[PDB]
């Protein structure tokens, strides 16, 4: 689940009418462009007092009311505009944008297609329709509609920028360098003319925008929330100045749209219950309804308090609830992601408000005080990228729930088909008892099942695509068929009950060569990165690159570019996206993971390391380009971090060419995923608590936020 693509409202210039009403409407349009929203509203309402049946003024007013979050009142005016003027295409397109924001995709499509039916040359409606295709996952149709819009209106920043991100999703790098310069130039122009930047904050990390531009895009996006809360005219809240009402406990509120089957929960679902109740009182504020999964069950049971704000959709009232609960530190787990209701933070119901874990960037906004990070991810020298003060965790700010979700991957055994650690692999909770039932098993620690009757039967189950067999009373599962056996084991909601078998043959990977993997969404790849990967493959004779169809339509673009850099097609192998458990388990088949420098694996980096797979990374400047080095520093593998592209290629080549070195580094990862802090949620929670108390003490003594960066 991605964010919703932004749309373009069309301001209608009034002509041919009474001078007074036309002038009021047109000047109102200008005041709206300048960010004088209230004054715009006053002017459209004067225009309507002068000429009650003024279709343009109804539609333009509705467009500013939509900006203010007054969606139902906006719809009322759009409909009045269309009643007065049934072929008013601007009003249908604008109404479309309002319906989209209300999550009525069908209504939005009905409005945009009506607009286009009225006026086929209406660029903005084509662009808005494009945004629906983009959000549906129909990239080729989104690209087509954005191209139509740009053909009709060649200077069209929202269309251009949303097109660029469509192209990024499918690794279309046609005219890439010129495209990157153009995005920078658009953003420069919009920041100068004080118009909302067409690059979304979350996407800004992918383009060679300056840090100040990235921060400024973030800020301007935060400012949208201000326009929505300003109409509530709510006074500042009075905050606790001590812990007396909470009996000496710090009240921490975790606000997320992701308490359910979402990557954020896959990272931090154990944290609420690990909080120490003698000093901390945990409130979890869900922005989404209960999705039925055990992720939601666990957080509901373990948190001291759970509060469903999806049932309190008015932001003023939701913020009042947070304030009534007495929260000292309110934690924004969303940032600029779908489901966020950053208006809640803009209302400042708590005295300390911190960004944490869910969003890999700055809010840019005055209403957030701190970003929870660490010295590797966010060295003080690069503080300019963030509006918040830095608040350092002692190792990495990243965490994962892999030890609780995937304990079956803490140990493995192999079958010696013919000794490799990653060709044919077994994992399971009863694996030890299964192996004790085979009298001929030998220990390397990694148990090895020799080629014997039992091993042949296992390999036969895999070769034939059978679901499972029973040997010696133990169920032995095909790793491709987990969802047919237990759907909750496949999603990570429960620990699998069978012994699962995972093989290179299941994914068409070679038995006698090095497998380099990357399991991120393809948008994280750029031309430099694929050239680096080709250089590595070229230096490691029969090695392959294992990527995902994420999405499948990017595959022929990656293959063509790879061919142009001298790789044959057979050197890159694509697999489908898998269920969570399979995705983590099958990383055990790779030799090495090659991290994406543009935007690293985050969740995906923790996934690969839980399998014992060394990851090679090159940290950049942005928070999103530095997370994997931070994970690796915490893990205790500094030799896997490159300072430049030559070193990343050399590290990866050496891992694929010196097999003793490979085994040594693999063994470090395998061991340190348990012995290091990286996956230790109890330790993590204890250090987060100390950080929270540093925040609180500083506030309680009467200070504004400061960087909390002391080694
Ligand atoms: O084959 C796959 C590949 C990925 N994932 C999961 O898909 C999500 C990818 O989210 P995102 O692209 O946000 O990951 P990040 O950017 O954090 O690495 C993560 O939860 C992965 O564990 C999956 O379940 N199956």
């Amino acid at each position: 689940e991605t964010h919703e693509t932004g749309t373009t409202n069309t301001a209608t210039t009034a002509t041919g009418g009474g001078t007074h009403a036309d002038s009021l409407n047109n000047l109102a349009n200008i005041k709206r462009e300048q960010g004088n929203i209230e004054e715009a509203v006053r002017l459209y309402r004067k225009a309507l007092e002068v000429f009650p049946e003024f279709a343009a003024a109804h539609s333009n007013l509705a467009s500013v009311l939509q900006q203010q979050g007054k969606l139902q009142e906006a719809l009322m005016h759009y409909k009045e505009a269309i009643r007065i003027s049934p072929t008013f295409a601007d009003a249908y397109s604008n109404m479309g944008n309002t319906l989209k924001e209300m999550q009525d995709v069908q209504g939005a499509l009905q409005c945009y297609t009506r607009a286009i039916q009225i006026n086929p040359a209406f660029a903005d409606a084509h662009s808005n329709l494009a945004s629906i295709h983009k959000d549906s996952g129909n990239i080729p149709e989104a690209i087509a509609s954005y191209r139509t819009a740009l053909k009709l209106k060649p200077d069209f920043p929202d269309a251009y920028c949303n097109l660029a991100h469509c192209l990024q999703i499918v690794c279309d790098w046609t005219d890439y360098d010129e495209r990157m310069k153009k995005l920078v130039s658009i953003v420069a122009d919009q920041l100068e003319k004080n118009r909302l930047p067409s690059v979304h904050p979350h996407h800004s990390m992918l383009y060679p925008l300056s840090h100040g531009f990235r921060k400024a895009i973030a800020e301007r996006h935060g400012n949208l929330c201000l326009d929505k809360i300003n109409v509530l005219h709510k006074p500042p809240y009075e905050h606790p100045k001590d812990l007396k009402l909470s009996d000496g406990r710090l009240r921490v509120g975790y606000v997320s749209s992701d308490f359910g089957n979402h990557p954020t929960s896959h990272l931090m679902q154990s944290i609420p219950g690990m909080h120490n109740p003698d000093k901390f009182e945990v409130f979890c504020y869900a922005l989404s309804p209960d999705d039925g999964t055990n992720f939601r069950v666990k957080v509901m049971a373990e948190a001291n308090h759970f509060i469903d704000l999806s049932q309190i959709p008015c932001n003023g009232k939701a913020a009042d609830r947070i304030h009534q609960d007495g929260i000292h530190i309110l934690v924004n787990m969303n940032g600029y992601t779908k489901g966020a209701r950053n208006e809640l933070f803009a209302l400042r119901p708590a005295p300390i408000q911190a960004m944490w874990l869910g969003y890999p960037g700055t809010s840019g906004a005055l209403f957030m005080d701190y970003i929870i990070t660490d010295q590797e991810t966010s060295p003080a020298e690069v503080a300019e990228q963030y509006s918040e003060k830095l608040a350092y965790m002692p190792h990495t700010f990243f965490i994962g729930d892999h030890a609780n979700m995937f304990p079956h991957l803490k140990k493995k055994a192999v079958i010696d088909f013919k000794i490799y650690d990653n060709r044919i692999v077994l994992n399971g909770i009863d694996l030890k008892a299964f192996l004790d039932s085979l009298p001929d098993v030998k220990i390397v620690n990694m148990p090895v099942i020799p080629m014997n009757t039992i091993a042949e039967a296992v390999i036969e189950m895999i070769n034939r695509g059978q679901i499972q067999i029973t040997i010696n009373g133990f169920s032995i599962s095909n790793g491709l068929a987990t969802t047919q056996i237990n759907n909750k084991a496949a999603t990570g909601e429960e620990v699998p009950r069978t012994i699962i078998v995972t093989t290179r043959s299941q994914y068409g990977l070679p038995e006698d060569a090095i497998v380099y993997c990357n399991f991120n969404q393809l948008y994280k790849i750029d031309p430099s990165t694929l050239q680096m990967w080709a250089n590595i493959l070229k230096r490691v004779p029969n090695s392959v690159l294992w990527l995902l169809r994420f999405p499948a339509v990017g595959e022929p673009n990656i293959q063509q570019y790879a061919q142009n850099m001298g790789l044959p097609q057979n050197r890159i192998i694509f697999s489908p996206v898998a269920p969570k458990e399979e995705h983590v388990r099958r990383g055990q088949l790779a030799d090495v993971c090659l991290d994406t420098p543009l935007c690293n694996g985050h969740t995906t980096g923790m996934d690969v390391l839980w399998a014992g797979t060394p990851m090679v990374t090159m940290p950049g400047e942005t928070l999103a380009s530095r997370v994997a080095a931070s994970q690796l520093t915490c893990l205790g593998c500094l030799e896997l971090i490159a300072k430049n592209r030559q070193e990343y290629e050399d590290i990866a080549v050496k891992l694929g060419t010196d097999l003793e070195y490979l085994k040594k580094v693999r063994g470090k990862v395998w061991k340190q995923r348990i012995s290091s802090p990286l996956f230790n949620t109890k330790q993590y929670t204890m250090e987060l608590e100390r950080l929270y108390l540093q925040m609180w003490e500083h506030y309680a003594a009467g200070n504004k936020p400061d960087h909390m960066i002391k080694p």
Side-chain angles (χ1 to χ4, degrees), residues 1-101 103-711:
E1 297 180 346
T2 54
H3 69 265
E4 261 199 332
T5 303
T7 55
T8 310
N9 288 336
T10 304
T12 307
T13 296
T15 71
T19 290
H20 188 11
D22 287 1
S23 302
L24 288 161
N25 172 267
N26 299 342
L27 180 56
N29 287 354
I30 301 296
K31 295 285 185 168
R32 191 208 68 75
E33 288 175 15
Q34 293 173 342
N36 302 125
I37 289 320
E38 298 192 13
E39 191 169 348
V41 168
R42 295 190 305 269
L43 296 166
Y44 293 122
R45 303 262 188 206
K46 284 165 179 173
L48 288 162
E49 175 176 13
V50 167
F51 179 27
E53 308 261 277
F54 190 177
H58 281 287
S59 175
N60 295 322
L61 169 56
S63 153
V64 186
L65 293 172
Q66 169 200 318
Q67 248 185 102
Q68 296 181 309
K70 293 176 179 189
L71 307 180
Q72 286 301 334
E73 192 183 0
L75 288 184
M76 178 180 68
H77 282 280
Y78 288 129
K79 291 168 175 171
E80 181 68 31
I82 288 158
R83 185 195 64 75
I84 291 160
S85 176
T87 58
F88 189 16
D90 295 351
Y92 269 105
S93 179
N94 292 342
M95 179 164 60
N97 297 336
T98 288
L99 292 175
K100 177 184 184 173
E101 179 173 343
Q103 308 307 111
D104 178 4
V105 182
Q106 171 158 151
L109 283 166
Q110 280 162 345
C111 288
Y112 301 142
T113 56
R114 181 52 175 143
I116 288 161
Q117 179 186 55
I118 291 162
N119 182 6
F122 186 14
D124 289 350
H126 285 284
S127 182
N128 293 338
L129 174 60
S131 82
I132 302 291
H133 297 309
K134 189 172 185 293
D135 292 349
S136 288
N138 184 350
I139 306 307
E141 201 67 75
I143 287 174
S145 282
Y146 280 129
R147 297 227 256 223
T148 295
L150 281 157
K151 173 167 200 189
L152 298 162
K153 183 163 75 186
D155 177 3
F156 193 172
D158 290 339
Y160 188 90
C161 293
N162 289 325
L163 171 65
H165 193 255
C166 290
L167 301 164
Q168 186 87 18
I169 287 166
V170 304
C171 301
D172 183 327
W173 304 329
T174 304
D175 294 312
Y176 182 79
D177 289 338
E178 167 194 338
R179 183 196 308 163
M180 299 301 96
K181 288 184 196 257
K182 183 141 194 206
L183 291 168
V184 170
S185 156
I186 287 172
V187 166
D189 191 70
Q190 296 175 311
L191 285 179
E192 188 178 77
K193 299 174 145 88
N194 180 52
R195 293 310 289 281
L196 181 67
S198 293
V199 169
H200 185 275
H202 198 184
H203 296 163
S204 73
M205 65 178 261
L206 309 168
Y207 312 135
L209 286 163
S210 66
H211 302 301
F213 279 14
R214 296 202 195 95
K215 186 168 66 177
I217 288 161
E219 189 273 331
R220 300 283 196 87
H221 282 257
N223 182 63
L224 302 179
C225 308
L226 297 179
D227 289 335
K228 288 178 184 186
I229 66 139
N230 283 346
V231 297
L232 305 178
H233 301 106
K234 285 172 65 80
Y237 289 100
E238 281 167 357
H239 294 134
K241 303 313 175 78
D242 60 56
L243 303 182
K244 292 151 134 56
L245 284 192
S246 45
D247 197 9
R249 308 204 284 153
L250 192 71
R251 299 178 157 157
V252 176
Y254 288 104
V255 184
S256 181
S257 65
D258 299 326
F259 296 125
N261 183 14
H262 305 276
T264 295
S265 296
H266 309 156
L267 304 177
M268 54 56 69
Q269 68 171 341
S270 299
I271 286 169
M274 271 163 184
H275 268 298
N276 173 1
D278 300 333
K279 298 292 185 176
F280 296 84
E281 194 185 7
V282 179
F283 298 68
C284 292
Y285 297 93
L287 306 178
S288 71
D290 185 337
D291 65 2
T293 67
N294 292 357
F295 305 108
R296 177 65 153 249
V297 173
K298 186 192 172 65
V299 180
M300 293 182 69
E302 294 184 3
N304 302 126
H305 313 281
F306 197 95
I307 301 86
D308 185 358
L309 298 182
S310 59
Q311 297 292 85
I312 306 178
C314 175
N315 286 318
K317 288 186 193 163
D320 286 347
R321 177 47 189 284
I322 294 166
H323 178 254
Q324 282 163 199
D325 287 352
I327 300 308
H328 305 104
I329 298 185
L330 193 67
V331 182
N332 184 338
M333 304 172 54
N334 275 80
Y336 302 116
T337 55
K338 202 27 51 200
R341 273 172 68 187
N342 293 316
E343 292 76 8
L344 300 175
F345 285 85
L347 285 166
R348 286 188 224 212
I352 301 159
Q353 304 193 154
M355 290 296 290
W356 176 66
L357 188 68
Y359 180 72
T362 185
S363 73
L366 295 169
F367 56 77
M368 301 309 303
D369 298 307
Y370 288 106
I371 181 164
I372 297 176
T373 185
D374 61 80
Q375 205 277 323
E376 305 295 327
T377 304
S378 305
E381 301 92 83
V382 300
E384 65 170 310
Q385 300 172 193
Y386 305 97
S387 52
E388 301 86 354
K389 302 300 188 204
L390 306 172
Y392 289 169
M393 290 288 284
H395 298 105
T396 181
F397 83 96
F398 226 81
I399 188 57
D401 205 45
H402 304 63
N404 173 54
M405 293 176 61
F406 314 118
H408 65 302
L409 313 173
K410 283 188 219 305
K411 295 165 168 191
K412 59 174 185 292
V414 297
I415 285 163
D416 183 20
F417 185 71
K418 182 290 182 304
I419 291 179
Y420 291 132
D421 69 347
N422 62 3
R423 269 58 173 187
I424 299 170
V425 179
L426 307 236
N427 309 98
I429 291 302
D430 299 323
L431 182 53
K432 178 96 279 276
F434 168 69
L435 296 166
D436 291 348
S437 93
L438 309 200
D440 52 344
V441 158
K442 55 268 148 78
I443 330 295
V444 164
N445 76 73
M446 188 183 62
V448 180
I449 298 174
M451 208 57 189
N452 58 13
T453 309
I454 276 165
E456 294 189 320
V458 173
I459 290 156
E460 257 286 90
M461 162 187 77
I462 298 294
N463 291 342
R464 296 184 70 77
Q466 274 154 218
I467 308 316
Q468 60 187 313
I469 60 180
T470 312
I471 302 184
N472 301 344
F474 298 94
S475 322
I476 317 287
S477 261
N478 184 330
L480 296 177
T482 316
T483 59
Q484 295 168 66
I485 298 173
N486 175 4
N487 130 86
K488 293 188 188 282
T491 62
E493 295 171 76
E494 296 186 355
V495 181
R497 279 187 271 277
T498 71
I499 292 159
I500 302 176
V501 182
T502 312
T503 79
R504 283 189 179 197
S505 69
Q506 286 177 311
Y507 300 104
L509 294 170
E511 305 288 328
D512 53 3
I514 289 295
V515 174
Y516 287 106
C517 73
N518 183 294
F519 298 150
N520 288 284
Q521 295 190 55
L522 294 181
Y523 77 81
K524 302 191 183 175
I525 305 167
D526 59 12
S528 309
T529 300
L530 188 64
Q531 173 68 66
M532 269 184 264
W533 292 349
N535 288 350
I536 292 156
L537 292 181
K538 287 176 146 210
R539 298 163 53 191
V540 180
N542 298 280
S543 62
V544 299
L545 183 62
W546 186 18
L547 300 180
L548 305 183
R549 289 189 172 106
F550 205 174
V553 292
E555 173 176 5
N557 296 332
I558 293 290
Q559 296 281 19
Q560 184 60 72
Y561 292 119
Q563 213 194 72
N564 299 338
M565 304 164 184
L567 286 188
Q569 178 159 72
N570 65 90
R571 304 290 300 280
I572 302 182
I573 295 167
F574 276 88
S575 294
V577 167
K580 186 81 180 194
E581 183 275 343
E582 186 190 331
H583 155 74
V584 179
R585 180 162 42 70
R586 73 187 173 182
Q588 284 175 119
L589 303 181
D591 294 289
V592 177
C593 170
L594 302 173
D595 184 49
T596 34
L598 178 63
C599 177
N600 305 163
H602 299 170
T603 306
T604 306
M606 303 291 286
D607 292 344
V608 101
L609 302 169
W610 193 242
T613 305
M615 177 172 53
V616 177
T617 188
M618 187 177 73
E621 294 219 33
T622 65
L623 180 158
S625 74
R626 292 183 68 81
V627 168
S630 182
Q631 294 166 352
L632 288 167
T633 299
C634 174
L635 184 66
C637 295
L638 299 178
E639 69 272 43
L640 295 172
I641 306 163
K643 298 186 175 61
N644 52 54
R645 285 180 304 171
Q646 191 57 60
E647 187 181 7
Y648 177 109
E649 295 168 0
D650 290 347
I651 291 168
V653 170
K654 181 179 176 155
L655 288 164
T657 58
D658 179 336
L659 307 184
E660 294 318 301
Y661 183 64
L662 181 65
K663 172 171 123 75
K664 197 245 287 254
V665 176
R666 288 177 68 77
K668 277 183 83 190
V669 179
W670 183 256
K671 180 206 140 77
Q672 288 162 34
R673 82 196 159 119
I674 309 299
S675 70
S676 87
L678 189 57
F679 295 89
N680 188 331
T681 52
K682 182 169 122 91
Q683 187 185 336
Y684 184 96
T685 302
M686 201 229 68
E687 334 273 27
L688 184 67
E689 286 170 342
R690 294 167 141 60
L691 188 57
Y692 284 154
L693 293 171
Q694 283 181 248
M695 294 173 176
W696 173 253
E697 283 158 21
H698 189 66
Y699 170 81
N703 310 106
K704 291 161 204 204
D706 279 298
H707 302 296
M708 300 297 170
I709 58 178
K710 168 154 165 212

